[PDB]
Amino acid sequence: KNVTLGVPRLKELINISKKPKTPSLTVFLLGQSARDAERA
Amino acid sequence: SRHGQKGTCGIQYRQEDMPFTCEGITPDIIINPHAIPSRMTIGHLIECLQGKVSANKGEIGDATPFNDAVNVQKISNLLSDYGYHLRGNEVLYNGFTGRKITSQIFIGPTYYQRLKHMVDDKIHSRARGPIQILNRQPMEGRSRDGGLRFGEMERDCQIAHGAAQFLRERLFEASDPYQVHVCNLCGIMAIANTRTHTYECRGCRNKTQISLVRMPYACKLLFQELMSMSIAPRMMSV
Amino acid sequence: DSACPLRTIKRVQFGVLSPDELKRMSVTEGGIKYPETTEGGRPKLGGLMDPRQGVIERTGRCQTCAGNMTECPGHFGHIELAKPVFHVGFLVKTMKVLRCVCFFCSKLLVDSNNPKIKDILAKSKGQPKKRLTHVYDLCKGKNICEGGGCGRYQPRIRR
Amino acid sequence: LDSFDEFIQMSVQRIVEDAPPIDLQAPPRYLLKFEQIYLSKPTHWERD
Amino acid sequence: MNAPPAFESFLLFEGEKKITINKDTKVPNACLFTINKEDHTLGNIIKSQLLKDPQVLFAGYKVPHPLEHKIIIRVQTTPDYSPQEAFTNAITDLISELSLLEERFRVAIKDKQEG
Amino acid sequence: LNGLTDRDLCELNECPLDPGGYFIINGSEKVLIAQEKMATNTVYVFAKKDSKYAYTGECRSCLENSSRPTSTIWVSMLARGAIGQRIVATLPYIKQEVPIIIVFRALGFVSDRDILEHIIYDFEDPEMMEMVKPSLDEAFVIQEQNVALNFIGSRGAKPGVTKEKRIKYAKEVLQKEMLPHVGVSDFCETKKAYFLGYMVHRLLLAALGRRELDDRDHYGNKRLDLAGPLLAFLFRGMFKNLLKEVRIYAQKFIDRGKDFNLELAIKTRIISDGLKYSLATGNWGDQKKAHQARAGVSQVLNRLTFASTLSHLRRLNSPIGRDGKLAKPRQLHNTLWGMVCPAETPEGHA
Amino acid sequence: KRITTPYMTKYERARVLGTRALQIAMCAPVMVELEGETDPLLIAMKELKARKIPIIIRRYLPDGSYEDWGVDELIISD
Amino acid sequence: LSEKDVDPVRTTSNDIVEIFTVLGIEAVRKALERELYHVISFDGSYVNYRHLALLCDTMTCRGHLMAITRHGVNRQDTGPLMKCSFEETVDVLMEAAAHGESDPMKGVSENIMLGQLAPAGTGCFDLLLDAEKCKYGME
Amino acid sequence: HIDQLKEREYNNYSWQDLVASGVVEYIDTLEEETVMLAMTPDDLQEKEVAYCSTYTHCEIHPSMILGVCASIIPFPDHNQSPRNTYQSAMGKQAMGVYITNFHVRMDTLAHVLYYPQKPLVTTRSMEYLRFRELPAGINSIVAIASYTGYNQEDSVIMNRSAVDRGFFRSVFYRSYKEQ
Amino acid sequence: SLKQRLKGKEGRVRGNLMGKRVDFSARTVITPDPNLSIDQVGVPRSIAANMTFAEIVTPFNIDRLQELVRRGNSQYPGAKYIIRDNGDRIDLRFHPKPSDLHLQTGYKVERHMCDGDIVIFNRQPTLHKMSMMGHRVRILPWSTFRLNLSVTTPYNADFDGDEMNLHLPQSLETRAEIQELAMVPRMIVTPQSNRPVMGIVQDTLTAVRKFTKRDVFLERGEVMNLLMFLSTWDGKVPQPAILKPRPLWTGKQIFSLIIPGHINCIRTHSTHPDDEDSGPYKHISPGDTKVVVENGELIMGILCKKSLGTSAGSLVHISYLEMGHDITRLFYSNIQTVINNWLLIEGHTIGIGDSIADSKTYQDIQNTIKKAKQDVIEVIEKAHNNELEPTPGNTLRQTFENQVNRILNDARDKTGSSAQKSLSEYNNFKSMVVSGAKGSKINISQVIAVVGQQNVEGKRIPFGFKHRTLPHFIKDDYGPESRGFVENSYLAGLTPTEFFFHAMGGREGLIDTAVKTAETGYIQRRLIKSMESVMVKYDATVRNSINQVVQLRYGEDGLAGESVEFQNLATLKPSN
DNA sequence: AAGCTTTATTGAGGCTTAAGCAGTGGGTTCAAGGTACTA
DNA sequence: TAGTACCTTTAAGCCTCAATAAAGCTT
RNA sequence: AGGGAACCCACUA
Ligand SMILES: [Mg+2]
Ligand SMILES: [Zn+2]
Ligand SMILES: [Zn+2]
Ligand SMILES: [Zn+2]
């Protein structure tokens, strides 16, 4: 994952950008689908 | 030096205050050790070593960039051939007390340049002097006895300090203090004949409800440039 | 020294300068009429370097007030324009009003008693600019005066 | 030096020669064509 | 532009006082000798000759600022002795040592010049 | 001072170590800083990013001796976001795009085999055929040279309502203003078509991945304007103004039915103070276009050290804006090896 | 009834010291027994430590109301 | 978040507007704090939490996302003199003149403009002379 | 070629006769992209594992990649590269003798050093920058020491006695004009 | 036009109302002065004889101001104007008639700026509120402003040509509020990160690491000379740590005299082993690497940037929190004076000998570089012969570049650590690194072992030619030499290709500096204008200018950021 | 019936506004040539 | 007739068009 | 006891 940091990310934070450069999620998986890679 | 190692002269000591070697060689210039590690100007140290070798040998050293005929070990062996430490250190003595310095000091001939940035070309102070014709603020630059710009970031820092009165004298009293008279009714700047004490406001046709207002001259200029745009910035002192 | 009471500003009220107010507060009573600034060695009355508008020379005095170049704040002249023209900073506001009022009877296109108008003066009572925005959004889709009032078709103002 | 020598030895003449001759009429014609240039040495003219 | 003249290293201006004693009350039997227009040359010899004195409990000098020409010598003695007396004795011993050094140097010059 | 010995230079109170290379303009020593630019007459294919064009092959074309304003032609491909991907052209003095096969029909070749012979040199790779088919598809309605020329002329700067006026205007645009380095005379439409097909072919290759894209900052793609080209660019405009004022003077003196004095007709101060102004101020143009022109072309020769003088006389300039926040023109490119010092550069906005 | 802090804030200390120093420099009666003192700032500081500055601080609450605290009523930090 | 076997509790985003439209204004305040903290502390540096909290509370004070721009700052209920000191000076003053806006002089930039004592630190109170305490001072 | 270039005045053999010999040639940047360069003729002798046996050109000397102001840096390959950049910036601000006819010139600003010295440690490229003839600086005995704390944070302690003897003394020229 | 007059940073509002040129300001070059206190600025006599403070005439100062008027504007400790009550200014530069030199109570004398005058002293860019602090004027001979060395960290200043601005407060009120709000000792600890902004720096830091080592023994005269520079010293010479055979004091005793009050602090030196605190010698440290200050006495431990620097919980921080700004100001000054005068005995250099390793270390470095280059050739041969399988998430190019960059970074790290192990305790590079004064371990590695890989926009050196980085390599060469891995140290010097690749890498930092200064300043200005009127009110709420509640309590706890500290919750982590 | 017609959402195009701080110094040009007319 | 005074760079927002679609009016 | 403006360029940290 190549998320933006530094001063560009701070500018994208304080200027409320509807199109940030690298939008992303951090999806967390419930229960047994997170224990093993096959159900993930 | 020729290695990006710039720096102002911090103090000048006489020859008897300078540290000295056993043969009485005081350095012309003492630079800080801390200028070297973060900058990694190792060519500066190699030039000092090579210059010691050159001054003792009588040659002019070769410091052409990509040369296998010159490395630090060859320069060191040449230097140790002249009765010096091979790494260019020497035992210096304290100039004040005469005692040997516990560390041995890297000393040697290095080419320094005097830069055109002198302090007598840069020292500037103002107390009160010429002011600009338009905004009546102090002039621009040291060549015309001008003031220094107490800019926006300085204003912001003085806000963060909470120093409201210092901010007020910087941005009002030490730049352009000014007095206007305002009509208490319309808020436009009145007409004030100070010698005959005749204050009036054309448009409201009053002559008694006029108030003196201390505002910066540049603010009066801003308001008169706003009135040229058909804005009425009515300063309501009520 | 001035005899006026020294007191600060608690409020700066903004507004547009009325032409009546410009004519009433001016020191150039006839208006600025001549483009030249000096009639020989004299500054021309009604010219651009009007002597009643401030202090010309560094060592002279003003004519409206008696103060020198330091004490004189400068006083406003005026040009009475032959034909009314647009203030360029106020163009967009003139167009916003023009699509909100009738081109012929100068009535508001929507009612002053309209329930939409009633609750947008409710929700934008202290905010004039947002009130204009809401009235403009109500009047943007219209094309004809409703009425009391006329029923003439209304144009599209294009700048 | 070489770029200026090229300009002052080749390019000025090429600019002068690659220009449309001017024709004037309206009535008789008037044709002006420009031929070789001459650059003198740098001279200064006094007030006399 | 702001260069001090080269003679304020060593010349007392009118009204400047060469040496002042200040009996500091922080510790018993101590003085602060503030010597004007002097440097490490006298401060160091006076300090070391004071350190040879067994009745001197403290002896140190300082230059408060090298851009000023002023020596502060602090001497503390045993209570049966005074810092002023210690300072005078140190200067007398330095003068006698330098006199002996000068005479022996003249003798050695005269011996080597002849052979 | 040309060809003088050291003794002769010292007789004239000149320094024998002085290198020259500057101008004395009103007693000020003025040095012409070399300006870099894209090379002319070379086809560069780039990827315009976040645009309607997927690829763009430009060719800044200059006559190489006459030096008119360099007329760039673009030959672009549209992005996918239509039943195919489509090649268009951006001709000079034609404010709208033209699809490329209409330009090829306007140049004289009407058949599709002739046009694809000018574009695709081997017919045995059909992958390149698949990309030219949409361009042939939207030029289906245009099958004749005058019809294509009308298509060109109906999108020009001022399309005259006469059809033959549009035809003549289009012929003039495609002869004198499209690819003039190929040729501007008559009977040059085959060479212009071959070069335009070469531009299309390069665009197809770059879009096929078969050729890598061109680098803006490759330094073989750049040229440097030294004192010669800069002064010639000035002198073209000032000699044009000299001939303009001669024609104005002589026109005013033949409408009166008289004769003019030609030695008195020449306004000798047009070249003189024009060159003097541009070298003294550094604005590279006319006095009335100071904001339009570029500044810093002529600088006062720095005389603080011999090394600063020598450095100032060998200085180059990328005229890209100093407030530009893109790092790539300021990068030390690989192709600067041995041509440009990797260490010597200013600190700050430049 | 006074809800503001019983301690004197640093801004209050700075402005009370400045105002009192200017008053002393304009020959106001000193409230404390100055002992060879000349600089009005040191006299104002000595008055502040002695809790003798004759100044009331009027602290404005954001709702518009105010609280009048005498300098002698506030706890002196520095 | 709606997917089966996806945690609807911990799943987040770095898109601030997406969190605001999906989850709300307090959620985007916490997310804004987290994102600014990540930017600041990735370098290894540390900023005290109250400064981040004040910035995030300022950005999310009025129920929507107030950008730190002329499109969030100059659209507040602050005075025309405060807005014109930031950006769009002539446009702000035109809009204030046309709508008759009244600047109550309660900010810092407003009083800095007019040379007055800013209600800021030292200037946020008045000092009164105590006549009863003045009776103990000798001339 | 070398023995015949050693006698450029006795022989009238020069660089152009070396170009005309087909021995050196000028290679621009587009042609440089099709050449195979040896850095040194060391690269041309056969190795036990050969990198390239198809060299078409050789560098004359690899230190010709530097310009005028970076050719005065001694040992620039031992320096961190921003420091070479800073010296290229600051060699232009160095005070020396900027030209030999400075007594004739009425320059608005002029800075002449009293006693410029040529460097004791030189590059071979400064024979062509004429830095040996118009040098800008003095060879200073420089100790790298922490002495009394006045050289901290990029400062310099100088010898006052040396400065009294003319060390880095210079003369400033200002010219004024009136019509 | 009028709009152009009112807009922009140069217009009326931003350029003449928010900020403006001011009177009573000075600017010159700054040079160091270790002999000044942290709240003093050394001012040239010409600046002070030109800048005037209007002193109101009282009966207290009738005679002093009369003498100042009598001296006039020519003599420096003199005056420039007399301002009467009616407001006219008697110019004292015309040496006027002696009826004018009369001074009444209520007159203002514009005396020259003298010693002890309060000034605001400022360096641009003014980023935070410690970039603009208050200083006491001290008049010194030459033409520069002179600063203490601990003070250069909040100003972000050095002495390679920096110029700073000096504003003189003109009123007693503003002089008082600069004195009570903005002086340097009050600005020691920042609310931004609840740590000091200013710490012991450079020479004093290197020499306080050298001074507080276990084997530093000072004789009687050396101790007395060092005690001469202790301003807070009570005049009692401490009992020496060793009395026989000869009386010797350690450096820890003299630093215990420097340490103020009864500070209680525990730190660790930079070179503290990770397995020592669990070992048998937890409180009897073999390397003197655990610092314990107990009752204001340095019991044990070598001081460094971790103890005397700008970190949170450090010795200067604990001193501030427990003792106040004045005691901590004296602490800073005493450290600098005593340590700087001991450095005259000890000395500190750096030479070409400190950058040189032994031949065993050179052989180890060359072996590591050779084996890493062979690993890169093996990875290249695997990628050529199709053996290279991609890691999940990446294609063959990011995995090949990742493998090659991992091999080369492991090379640089391993051989840098091999270089650093060779450094003796006499090494001066190591002296400045392990004290935290200047430089890091990557600097030692680059100087001694290997410079490493040059990177342009994150990747290796790009193929700027047709599939070559330079025309000295063959096409499609992906090896370490071809793509910018510098194989030599700065001591050994770089090959011409390595020199060019290193210049390509070093150009990136220059470009990044320029563009980040362009953009970050706009970000900072927008941050200021969005919150400039937000403040803590007297009901302790945090409101903006509209009186809209931003926070009901500041920071949600109601505390200020300066006084808070990193602490540990005891009951959170342990099991039931 | 299934056609006809009207007021609220979308997508692209056009306009506007912004782009670090503080310092030095120099250099140039503004303000310029035809004219229409007299003692 | 000669001569002097006067004539004339890009990046993000907001706003405003053309284009649609349920839904009521009119077969 | 103090009669310039505007722009451009170079530079300083
Ligand atoms: Mg600096
Ligand atoms: Zn009125
Ligand atoms: Zn007036
Ligand atoms: Zn109507």
Coordinates of C-alpha atoms and ligand atoms in Angstrom, one line a residue, chain C residues 101-109 144-152 154, ligand 4:
Chain C
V101 CA -37.2 41.4 -9.2
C102 CA -39.5 42.0 -12.1
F103 CA -38.1 43.6 -15.2
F104 CA -41.1 46.0 -15.5
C105 CA -43.0 46.5 -12.3
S106 CA -39.9 45.9 -10.0
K107 CA -41.9 43.6 -7.7
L108 CA -40.4 40.6 -6.1
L109 CA -41.1 37.5 -8.3
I144 CA -42.9 35.1 -15.6
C145 CA -44.2 37.6 -13.0
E146 CA -47.1 35.9 -11.1
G147 CA -49.0 38.8 -9.5
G148 CA -50.7 41.6 -7.3
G149 CA -48.6 42.5 -10.3
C150 CA -48.1 42.1 -14.0
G151 CA -47.6 38.8 -15.9
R152 CA -45.0 39.8 -18.5
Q154 CA -39.0 37.9 -17.9
Ligands
ZN4 ZN -44.1 42.2 -12.8

